[PDB]
Subunit: 214 residues, 3 copies
Amino acid sequence: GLEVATYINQLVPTNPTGSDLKSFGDDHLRLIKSAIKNTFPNISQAVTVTAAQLNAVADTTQYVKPGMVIMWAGSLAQIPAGWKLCNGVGTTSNGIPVPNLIGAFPWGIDGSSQAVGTRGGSANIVWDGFTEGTALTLAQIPAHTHTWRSRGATTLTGSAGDSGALTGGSGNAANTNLETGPAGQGQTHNHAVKINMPLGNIPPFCSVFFIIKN
Amino acid sequence: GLEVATYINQLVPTNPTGSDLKSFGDDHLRLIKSAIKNTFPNISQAVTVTAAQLNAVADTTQYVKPGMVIMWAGSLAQIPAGWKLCNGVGTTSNGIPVPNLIGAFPWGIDGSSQAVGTRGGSANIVWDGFTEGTALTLAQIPAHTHTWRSRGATTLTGSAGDSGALTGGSGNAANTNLETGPAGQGQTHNHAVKINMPLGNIPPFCSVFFIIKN
Amino acid sequence: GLEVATYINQLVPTNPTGSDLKSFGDDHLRLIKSAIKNTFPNISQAVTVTAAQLNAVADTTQYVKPGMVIMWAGSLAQIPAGWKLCNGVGTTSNGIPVPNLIGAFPWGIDGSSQAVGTRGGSANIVWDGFTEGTALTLAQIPAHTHTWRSRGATTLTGSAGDSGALTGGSGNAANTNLETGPAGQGQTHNHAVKINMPLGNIPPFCSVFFIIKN
């Protein structure tokens, strides 16, 4: 007979039976047209895709799920919709907090060594140098000599009966041109280093934005 | 005449010619309905997209290809389907080996300097401290002297006819209160360093997961 | 009446009124078929997706825009179409300049500290070693002594009345076996370091390509 259908899913593929009257046939035609106009109200051009391509839409693994992060080479004004700069401020659509990547690096973690989004390391933390002593040899000292000057007006008691003793009374120190044998030459005394070096050395980098999909 | 079609592609646009019998017209109607019901069996609501949007599905360059890798800001449990953690184990669908990114950084390469996925650099390789000696000056030595002591009971052979010589035999060393000239005062001696420092320094980073699309 | 329609959007859902002639009805049928054949020229199999999935195509937040950059684990030959190596050469389709990531690291910037694509830091900048001096103690000297050698034929003017002075003129240097008191033994003198160390120590990394979506 005749049925009420708004969308194509409600069409009855056997309704206009052979015994039905022709006076309703016109209505049937109208009905069919109506159905199409209620299912594709905006289609006006040719749809050239095939059935396989249309069925491929159902796959969702292709589509980018919320929560991924990317680095952005464009300006901040042209940031794509649904992506927020990874400033560490705010949460995503599902509530995951935005990580902070400003002036940092992506350090691959297993989720157990560090908490996700943890910021660590620095280019300049603390600095201190420290050597250690050198076992000096006799030649470590320079080619130095000790001048021999007898204190005051020294009168050495060397005669027949008294042993030779440089008995020097206080007074004008008689600087004789007497010298003692030089010792040492000023050789090389070497040390090791136990420097404190948390000063980080930044390798070559590039400056790019960081945006996480909302 | 009349045709039999399973899908809309087999509909004949000129079949019900003006010379055909009217008793077949009903059949035609049924046929049309059947065709639609076999081509869109799951469509029940309005489809508001336009032809251009539907034709855009054929474009695949925007679709993300297998083997792409990304940083994931969520937990390991909430990893999106089609992605595997960057543990360096296994291969992709097309056979690309999985690189290991745990505890590493993304080092941009041109494919000629290093092989893709190669792990280089380390936070601790080796260390050695090594200064060198200083060309010491005469004042490098501290304020030190050498006391004048005579070995044994040293007696000078100083008389009228014998040259004064402190000819001292073995005996009790009588140390007289004589002191030689001081040499030096202990000035500053500087060294340079030839340190061996491959011990890597960790710059600022952030802790995130890494997953590659299967 | 009868209308001229090429696509489904031009169909009049109320055209075949009840007062129209039967002789035109056949034409109506043809028209409908033609419309469908002109709207889906390539559909030849069942389309099992639902209305909601087709409607979801209109969303573009699901679509990765031109401009962002990704890192790639595959070979250079198998780079996906529409992606060009981030060699710093050229611009995108919308005009975003290509950053250079060869031998670089991703440095997150807020758009004010640095411009996009800025490169800094190096693996080998400069190196200088520099210790400092230490105030040497009196014990810093090694176990060294100075011999008491008398210049020339040294004779003391020691008589009964004349002060004993080792008045030694030039001549044969008479070396008496007299040794002055040794001082020091060469103990530990310690310093610090003020090394100039910008040579980059690259932390552990991995080698991955960098490609920008054109």
